[PDB]
Amino acid sequence: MIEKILLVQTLKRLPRMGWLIKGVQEPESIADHSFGVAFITLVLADVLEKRGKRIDVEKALKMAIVHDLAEAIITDIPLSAQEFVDKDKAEALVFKKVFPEFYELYREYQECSSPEAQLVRIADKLDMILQAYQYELSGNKNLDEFWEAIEEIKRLELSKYLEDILNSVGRLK
């Protein structure tokens, strides 16, 4: 339906708030980010494929495309604000009322248990670490917490199959 699409297209206009709070001049939109997660999810899926780890690619890509979809209505409430706002409670609600067809993908994603759910989570973090890397090259000097994003990925089983990649990333540091 046209009304749903027009709604999700608001993501092209919504900024990724963390960057603004860090003084990043023209930050990427939530949609730019979502594209990045989707692409990294695709690329990583192939790597996992040829390393013996089988992944339900379809589910993965759908999960990457829809993972931040609730923000089309509640916006990318930054982590710094989440000490005062329950963004999680809000997301579930929106998915249950506005995006019921995607609530299963959302629910599984939050659980971060399945191979697909962990992949998207890793793609989410990599797009960010690497986006931070870019903004650093642009001159921003307060993109400080990366050893804890890298470390957050390391805490996921699925990372075991990607250690060499995550090593190249931390090497950009």
Residues found near Ni ion in the complex (CB under 5 A): 68, 124
Interface map 115-144 toward its own copies (x if CB under 8 A): -----------xx--xx-xxx-xxxxxx--
Range 22-51, binding its own copies (CB under 8 A): 23-26, 28-29, 31-36, 38-40, 42-43, 46
The closest of 45, 79, 73, 40 to 59, measured between CA atoms, is: 45
Could you say which of Ni ion, its own copies, none residue 81 binds, taking C-beta under 5 to 8 angstroms by partner kind?
Answer: its own copies
Closer by beta carbon to its own copies, 66 or else 120: 66
71 touches 90 (CB < 8 A): no
The closest of 52, 10, 81, 9 to 160, measured between CA atoms, is: 52
Closer by beta carbon to its own copies, 66 or else 158: 66
Which residue intervals of 16-162 are DSSP H helices?
17-21, 30-49, 57-66, 71-74, 87-97, 103-111, 115-137, 147-154
The closest of 143, 105, 109, 141 to 123, measured between CA atoms, is: 109
Q: Should residue 148 be labelled a site residue for its own copies when binding is judged by CB under 8 A? A: no
Q: Should residue 55 be labelled a site residue for its own copies when binding is judged by CB under 8 A? A: no
Q: Whole-number minimum distance, CB 127 to Ni ion, in Å?
A: 7
Could you say which of Ni ion, its own copies, none residue 152 binds, taking C-beta under 5 to 8 angstroms by partner kind?
Answer: none
